[PDB]
Curated annotation (Swiss-Prot), chain A:
Sections of the chain in a coiled coil: none
Range of the intact protein held here: 425 to 529 of 1058
Quaternary structure and partners: Associates with the helicase and the primase-associated factor to form the helicase-primase factor.
Organism: Human herpesvirus 1 (strain 17)
Recorded family membership: Belongs to the herpesviridae DNA primase family.
Localisation per UniProt entry: Host nucleus
UniProt protein name: DNA primase
Described function: Essential component of the helicase/primase complex. Unwinds the DNA at the replication forks and generates single-stranded DNA for both leading and lagging strand synthesis. The primase initiates primer synthesis and thereby produces large amount of short RNA primers on the lagging strand that the polymerase elongates using dNTPs.
From Swiss-Prot, chain B:
Annotated function: Component of the helicase/primase complex. Unwinds the DNA at the replication forks and generates single-stranded DNA for both leading and lagging strand synthesis. The primase synthesizes short RNA primers on the lagging strand that the polymerase presumably elongates using dNTPs. The primase-associated factor has no known catalytic activity in the complex and may serve to facilitate the formation of the replisome by directly interacting with the origin-binding protein and the polymerase.
Main localization, broad class: host cell
Gene Ontology BP terms: bidirectional double-stranded viral DNA replication; DNA replication
Protein name in the entry: DNA helicase/primase complex-associated protein
One Pfam family hit: Herpes_HEPA
Localization, UniProt: Host nucleus
GO CC, one annotated term: host cell nucleus
Membrane-spanning ranges: none
Subunit relationships: Associates with the primase and the helicase to form the helicase-primase complex. Interacts with the origin-binding protein. Interacts with the polymerase catalytic subunit.
Keywords from the named record: DNA replication, Host nucleus
InterPro entries: HSV_HEPA
C-alpha cells in the first residue's frame, strides 16, 4: 500500500495516537459483566434512532427459543470489540461516545 | 340552444376543475357533473364560470377499461368526497375510478360545450338566465395574459403510531412507505387535525405566512390575510339536473395562476392537511354546495409510480407543480411543466393513458390499422413474437477493427409510428369526437424535436399506451420488423453491413479505405441519405403517413467495435480518443467509477493492439486488466466510510431485505418514497451483513462498518463480464477473466 492508502490503513487499523499516552485520569467505561450489558443496552438504544441495527438477543427462560442459545458469556466481548473498532465518519463523535458518555474519545 | 340571448365574451381559461357530481331525479344509466372554470380577461381579472355535463354509463365503462363499474359506485364516492372532515382521502380506495371519472368528464365537456384549451383566447357564450356557459369557440383578439406563479413552502408534522405503518406494510410486502403513511392518515383522519404546520406562500404582490401549533387552534404566528390571496365568490346557477336554484361558493386566485413547490422535501400529507383546513373553515356557513375534495399522485398506489406529481381534481381549483430543486435549470423545468399542463389539458399525468384514447377503444383502432396495411406486413404482424430475432447479424463476444463503424438512429420512431397508425385506424372509431384526443398526440409528435418536455411526455406515454392494449404492441413490433427488413435490404447496396440494432437505432460497418479520412465521410452521408429515402418510401407504401418528416441521425463515426452481449457494446475511435459504452448497469454512485475504469482499461487494451504482436499481447492485456482491478479496489478503500456511495437502488419489482422496525420511526422522511429505495449493507457483528435503508433515517448516520466486500464483489462481477468478452472477442481466447478478490485484497475490509 503506497500513498494516502498507507496512512489511511495505519490510522484505521491501529489504536488512536493518543490512546496509549499517559494522562492524569482515565476516561473509559469499566464495570462488571451485567452492568456492562446494561450500559451496552442503553447505548444501543441511544444509537438505534440513527441507523444502528438492533441486537435482538435471546435468553433462557424466554417465551421463544429460536436459534443461537449461548447466554451472556461471549456476547458481551464481541459487541464491545465491534464498538471499539468503529471509526468516526468525520467531525462527529464515534459510536463508543454513546457508551463512555464523553464527546472527546 | 337559442342564440338570441347568448352573451358572448372574450376571455381565457386557466384551470378546469371538478366541482360536483350528482344523479338527476330519475336516472339509472347516466349522471350529471358540474365543473368550474377559472377564467381571465385581457388585462388580468379573475372570473368564475360553471358548466354542466351529462355522462352516460357506456362512456364510464369505456374509460374505466373494464365492465365492473356502475353509476352508483361513482355517485356514492363523489358524495363521500364532499366532506373532507371525515374522508379526506377518498381516491385512495380506488384511484382508477377517479381517473376514469376525470377523463370521462373532460371528454364530455370537450364534446358537448365545444373545443376548450387552457391559456388560449376563447369566445365564451353563456345563458344569463341559467348562469352556465353553453358554448366555447376559438377566436383571436390579441395576446392573452401571461401565467403567474406563486412559491409554496408547506411543512407538517403528523404523528402516526409506527405500529399501524408496520401492520399495513406487513399486509402488502412490497408497499411503498408513502402509501402506508397516506393509508394510516386515512384510517384515523384526526391525526391531520392535531398536526403542527408552517405555510409560506410568496406571490408577486403579497406574502402569506402562517404557523399553526395545532391546526384546530388559531395560529401562533401570522403574516398577511386570506383575503389577499383568494377571493370568495358566491354564484347562483339553475342547472337542468336540479329542480330548484343551486348556489356555489368558490375560491378565486388573485395575481397568480398556479403554485410551484420545490421538490427537495415534498410531502403530500402536508398539502392535504392544509387544503382540508381551508375547506373546513371556508365551507362552514350553511347555504351553499360543497366541492369535491380529491387529489391524485404516485403515493395513492401501493407500488408507487416513477413520475412524481400532485394532481388536484377538485378543491381548491388551481394546479400545483412539484419541481426538483438544486438544478440551475429550475426555470426551464417549471416552464416545461406549465407547457405540458397547458398542451395536454391538465389531465396528464393523472389520467395516464386515457388522455389519448379510452382503453376500450384501442382494440378496434389496432384491428383497422392492421387490416389496411399490406399483405406481407399483415403476415409479419400476425406472426410477431417479442423474443424474436430478424436482423442483428452479429453475436456474443466479437470485435471489428480497424474498420469504419457507424451508428444511426431514428429519433422517436415509436411515437411517430403510433401517431401514424392511430390516424389509420381512426376510421374504426365509433365515436367521431374521439379524434381530438389523437390530435393532442399529433401535437406532441410535432413538438418532440425542439421541446424536451414533449419528448419526455411521449417517452412516458407510449409504453403506457402499449401496456393498455397488447395488440398495439404487436402491431408496432410488426411494422418495426418490416422497417428493419427494408433497412437491411437497402443497406445491402450502399457499401454497408448492419452489425446490430433493433430498427429505431442501429450500427454497422462500411467498406472503404481505412486510412483515407477524406473519402470515408463522403460514403457515410450517402448511406444515410439512401437509408432515409428507402425507409420513407417503404413507410409511404403501406399508406402510413407521418407528420414530422423522417430524419435519420448519425450518432458518430468510430473505428473499433467490441460486443460482449446482446445489449452491451463498446465503440472507439483511434484518431481522437472518443468512445461510447453501452450495456453497463448503473444502480449507484459506485458504478460510475467502475464504468470509467472499464472505459479507460478498454482504451489502453485496444490501443496496445496496433503493435501487431502474437498471443503475448493477450498476456499483456490480462496484466493491464488485473492492474486496473487492483487500482479500482485500492481507490475504493478511501470511501469505505461513505454510506451513500455504496447504496444501491431497488425498484418495487425486485426482492429486497425486510424493513427494520426503526425505519418506521422516520416520520416526514417516509413521504418521499414514490418509486425507488436506496439500500446499503453493513456488518453489525460476526458475518451478519444486514441491510439498511439509507434515506429513512435523519442525518448524520451512525452505522457499523460498511460491507464493502459484498458491493465490490457485485461490481467486480460486471467488470469481469465485459473484460472476459473483450478478451474472447479481440484475441479469440477461451479463458474466463477472474480476479482473485478473496486471496488478494479481501483483508482490507475484514
Amino acid at each position: 500500500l503506497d500513498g494516502d492508502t498507507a496512512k489511511a490503513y495505519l490510522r484505521a487499523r491501529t489504536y488512536a495516537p493518543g490512546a496509549l499516552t499517559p494522562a492524569p485520569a482515565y476516561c473509559g467505561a469499566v464495570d462488571s459483566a451485567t452492568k456492562m450489558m446494561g450500559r451496552l443496552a442503553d447505548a444501543e438504544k441511544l444509537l438505534v434512532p440513527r441507523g444502528w441495527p438492533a441486537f435482538a438477543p435471546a435468553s433462557p427462560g424466554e417465551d421463544t427459543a429460536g436459534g443461537t442459545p449461548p447466554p451472556q458469556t461471549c456476547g458481551i466481548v464481541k459487541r464491545l470489540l465491534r464498538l471499539a473498532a468503529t471509526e468516526q465518519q468525520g467531525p462527529t463523535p464515534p459510536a463508543i461516545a454513546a457508551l463512555i458518555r464523553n464527546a472527546a474519545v | 340552444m337559442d342564440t338570441a340571448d347568448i352573451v358572448w365574451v372574450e376571455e381565457s381559461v386557466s384551470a378546469i376543475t371538478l366541482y360536483a357530481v350528482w344523479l338527476p331525479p330519475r336516472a339509472r344509466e347516466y349522471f350529471h357533473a358540474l365543473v368550474y372554470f377559472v377564467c381571465r380577461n385581457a388585462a388580468g381579472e379573475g372570473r368564475a364560470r360553471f358548466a354542466e355535463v351529462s355522462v352516460t354509463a357506456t362512456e364510464l365503462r369505456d374509460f374505466y377499461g373494464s365492465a365492473d363499474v356502475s353509476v352508483q359506485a361513482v355517485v356514492a364516492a363523489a358524495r363521500a368526497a364532499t366532506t373532507p372532515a371525515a374522508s379526506p382521502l377518498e381516491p385512495l380506495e380506488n384511484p382508477t375510478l377517479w381517473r376514469a371519472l376525470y377523463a370521462c368528464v373532460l371528454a364530455a365537456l370537450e364534446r358537448q360545450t365545444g373545443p376548450v384549451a387552457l391559456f388560449a383566447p376563447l369566445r365564451i357564450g353563456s345563458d344569463p338566465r341559467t348562469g352556465l356557459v353553453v358554448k366555447v369557440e376559438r377566436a383571436s383578439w390579441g395576446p392573452p395574459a401571461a401565467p403567474r406563479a406563486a412559491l409554496l413552502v408547506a411543512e407538517a408534522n403528523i404523528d402516526i403510531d409506527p405500529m399501524a405503518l408496520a401492520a399495513r406494510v406487513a399486509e402488502h410486502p412490497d408497499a411503498r412507505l408513502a402509501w402506508a403513511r397516506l393509508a394510516a392518515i386515512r384510517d384515523t383522519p384526526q391525526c391531520a387535525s392535531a398536526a403542527s404546520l408552517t405555510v409560506n406562500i410568496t406571490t408577486g404582490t403579497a406574502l402569506f405566512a402562517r404557523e399553526y401549533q395545532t391546526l384546530a387552534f388559531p395560529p401562533i404566528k401570522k403574516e398577511g390575510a386570506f383575503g389577499d390571496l383568494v377571493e370568495v365568490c358566491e354564484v347562483g346557477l339553475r342547472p337542468r339536473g336540479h329542480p330548484q336554484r343551486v348556489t356555489a361558493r368558490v375560491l378565486l386566485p388573485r395575481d397568480y395562476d398556479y403554485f410551484v413547490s420545490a421538490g427537495e422535501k415534498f410531502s403530500a400529507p402536508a398539502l392535504v392537511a392544509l387544503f382540508r383546513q381551508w375547506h373546513t373553515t371556508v365551507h362552514a356557513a350553511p347555504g351553499a354546495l360543497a366541492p369535491v375534495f380529491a387529489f391524485l399522485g404516485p403515493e395513492f398506489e401501493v407500488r408507487g409510480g416513477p413520475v412524481p406529481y400532485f394532481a388536484v381534481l377538485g378543491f381548491p381549483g388551481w394546479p400545483t407543480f412539484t419541481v426538483p430543486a438544486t438544478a440551475e435549470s429550475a426555470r426551464d423545468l417549471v416552464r416545461g411543466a406549465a407547457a405540458a399542463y397547458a398542451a395536454l389539458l391538465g389531465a396528464w399525468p393523472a389520467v395516464g393513458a386515457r388522455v389519448v384514447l379510452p382503453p376500450r377503444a384501442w382494440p378496434g383502432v389496432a384491428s383497422a390499422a392492421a387490416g389496411c396495411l399490406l399483405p406481407a406486413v399483415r403476415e409479419a404482424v400476425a406472426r410477431w413474437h417479442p423474443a424474436t430475432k430478424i436482423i442483428q447479424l452479429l453475436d456474443p463476444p466479437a470485435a471489428v477493427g480497424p474498420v469504419w463503424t457507424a451508428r444511426f438512429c431514428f429519433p422517436g420512431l415509436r411515437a411517430q409510428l403510433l401517431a401514424a397508425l392511430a390516424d389509420l385506424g381512426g376510421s374504426g372509431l365509433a365515436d367521431p369526437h374521439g379524434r381530438t384526443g389523437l390530435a393532442r398526440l399529433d401535437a406532441l409528435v410535432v413538438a418532440a424535436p425542439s421541446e424536451p418536455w414533449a419528448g419526455a411526455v411521449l417517452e412516458r406515454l407510449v409504453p403506457d399506451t402499449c401496456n393498455a392494449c397488447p395488440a398495439l404492441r404487436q402491431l408496432l413490433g410488426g411494422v418495426m420488423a418490416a422497417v428493419c427488413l427494408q433497412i437491411e435490404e437497402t443497406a445491402s447496396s450502399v457499401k454497408f453491413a448492419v452489425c446490430g440494432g433493433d430498427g429505431g437505432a442501429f450500427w454497422g460497418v462500411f467498406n472503404v479505405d481505412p486510412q483515407d479520412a477524406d473519402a470515408a465521410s463522403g460514403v457515410i452521408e450517402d448511406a444515410r441519405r439512401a437509408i432515409e429515402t428507402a425507409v420513407g418510401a417503404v413507410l409511404r407504401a403501406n399508406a402510413v403517413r407521418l407528420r414530422h418528416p423522417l430524419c435519420l441521425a448519425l450518432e458518430g463515426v468510430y473505428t473499433h467495435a467490441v460486443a460482449w452481449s446482446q445489449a452491451g457494446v463498446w465503440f472507439w475511435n483511434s484518431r481522437d480518443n472518443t468512445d461510447h459504452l453501452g450495456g453497463f448497469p448503473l444502480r449507484g454512485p459506485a458504478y460510475t467509477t467502475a464504468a470509467g475504469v472499464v472505459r479507460d482499461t478498454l482504451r489502453r487494451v485496444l490501443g496496445l493492439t496496433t503493435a501487431c504482436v502474437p498471443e503475448e499481447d493477450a498476456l499483456t492485456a490480462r496484466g493491464l486488466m488485473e492492474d486496473a482491478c487492483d487500482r479500482l479496489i485500492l481507490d475504493a478503500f478511501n470511501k469505505r466510510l461513505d454510506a451513500e456511495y455504496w447504496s444501491v437502488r431497488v425498484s418495487p419489482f425486485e426482492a429486497s431485505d425486510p424493513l427494520p422496525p426503526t425505519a418506521f420511526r422516520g416520520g416526514a422522511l417516509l413521504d418521499a418514497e414514490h418509486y425507488w429505495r436506496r439500500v446499503v449493507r453493513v456488518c453489525p457483528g460476526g458475518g451478519e451483513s444486514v441491510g439498511v435503508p439509507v434515506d429513512l433515517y435523519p442525518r448524520p448516520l451512525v452505522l457499523p462498518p460498511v460491507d464493502c466486500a459484498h458491493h465490490l464483489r457485485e461490481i467486480l462481477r460486471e467488470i469481469e463480464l465485459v473484460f472476459t468478452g473483450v478478451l474472447a472477442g479481440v484475441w479469440g481466447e477461451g479463458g474466463k477473466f477472474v480476479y482473485p478478490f478473496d486471496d488478494k485484497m479481501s483483508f482490507l475490509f475484514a
